[PDB]
């Protein structure tokens, strides 16, 4: 069941190759890739959530992703995976995707945004399925023999592997500040904003309304948004909120292993 996702939110992460040969910060990013099954299937973890709308309802045609300070919906039809030749997607849930695809040295994922803009992220990988038996073959025969092997099960039931969620840290955003006639204005736009200035008077505070600080220049101050109501997975790519973090909940990892024949 999807009930465990009601309080969560997506996040942004760093990507080492954003498609032009340069890095950027992307709404889609890759986590560790697992290759334990002897039949050559993959389990991939991403930062976006598939199958849940922004109103915490179930709809298998939609995905939701993070925009600037707010989630938004997008169509599932744009999801693609390839490793040289295109991959075949066999099932999805939440942060995880299963797919089968041929040999290669890279792995790429991407999707289409709500404004007709594409995003991709690429990581290196080495893919080479194992050999079963005393012969090497390329496809499934009609007349043959059966041997043991293992696979992944298409099941969403609860299992013993779990991951944890925590409170997000504060997020800086320089666009909240503007300079006019020797003064700097702060626009809150309905959010709780904390500010610091190095101008005369040592101004510190936490505000919910617009403020003007007189006799001060831009780039002598700092501002960030501090008040959050949702929980986030503690990815290694984001800073810790406090020296000793507090736990809010946990979710399970689908698709266990099982024994089959080949």
């Amino acid at each position, epitope marked *: 069941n999807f009930n465990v996702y009601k309080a969560t939110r997506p996040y942004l992460a760093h990507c080492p190759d954003c498609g032009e040969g340069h890095s950027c910060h992307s709404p889609i990013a890759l986590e560790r890739i697992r290759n334990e099954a002897t039949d050559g299937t993959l389990k991939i973890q991403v930062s976006l959530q598939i199958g849940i709308k922004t109103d915490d309802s179930h709809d298998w045609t939609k995905l939701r992703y993070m925009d600037s300070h707010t989630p938004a919906d997008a169509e599932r039809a744009g999801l693609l995976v390839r490793t040289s030749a295109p991959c075949t997607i066999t099932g999805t849930m939440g942060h995880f995707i299963l797919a089968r695809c041929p040999k290669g040295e890279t792995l790429t994922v991407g999707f289409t945004d709500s404004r007709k803009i594409s995003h991709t992220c690429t990581h290196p990988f080495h893919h080479e399925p194992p050999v079963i038996g005393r012969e090497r073959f390329h496809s499934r025969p009609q007349h043959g023999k059966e041997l043991p092997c293992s696979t992944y099960v298409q099941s969403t039931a609860a299992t013993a592997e779990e991951i944890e969620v925590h409170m997000p840290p504060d997020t800086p955003d320089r666009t909240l500040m503007t300079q006019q006639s020797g*003064n700097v204005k702060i*626009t809150v*736009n*309905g959010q709780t904003v904390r500010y610091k200035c190095n101008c005369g008077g040592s101004n510190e505070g936490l505000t919910t*309304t*617009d*403020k*003007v600080i*007189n006799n001060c220049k831009i780039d002598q101050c700092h501002a960030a948004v501090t008040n959050h109501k949702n929980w986030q997975y503690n990815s290694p790519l984001v800073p810790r909120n406090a020296e000793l973090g507090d736990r809010k909940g946990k979710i399970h990892i689908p698709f266990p292993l099982a024994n089959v024949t080949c």
Partner: antibody
Amino acid sequence: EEQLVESGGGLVQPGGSLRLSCAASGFTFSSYSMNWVRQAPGKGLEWVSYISSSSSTIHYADSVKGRFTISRDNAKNSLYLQMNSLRAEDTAVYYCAREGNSGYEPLDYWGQGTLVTVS
Amino acid sequence: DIQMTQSPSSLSASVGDRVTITCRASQSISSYLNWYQQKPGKAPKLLIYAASSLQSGVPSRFSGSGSGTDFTLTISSLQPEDFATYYCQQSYSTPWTFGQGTKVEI
């Protein structure tokens, strides 16, 4: 010169509605925030509502929630305050005021309000 | 949230006497306090917008200063035109609040 002109008062029966308008001259309307305040004989000063210059931030007093809504039009140079579900106790003079574009949250100008009676 | 009180509730003084009015708060205001003055029958009201600051158009007889929850305003000369009602306002948080009012009579 700066002016604030209040109009739209009168007597309304209980359960009705009344719209107040505040007109402005002498300054750039879109550059300043505005507030509404209330006063009545035997009573002191009270803040009612606030609207930011871009209509992005709105606050209401706890005693006036639901019955009151505030809006503005930066192209028509007009400020509105609308009261719905009027109750007999809501008899007072309502005023509009300007908020200054400087530090330490000054109020530089006040209007001259109109009497609203519910009875 | 932030409660304010001022004292005395009224003053009784003759022309030529000085006027002192103080305002107190239950919470820190960090100098975000202003003063108002008006006569009966009028909506407009205005005094100094900040501690140790003089508002444009205000005669030099009006002065005051501020401190932690303790604000003071004085008048150096009391003339027949100076008899009015005074208020304090704090603008540190939301909602904005006012004092109860002080009157000066001859």
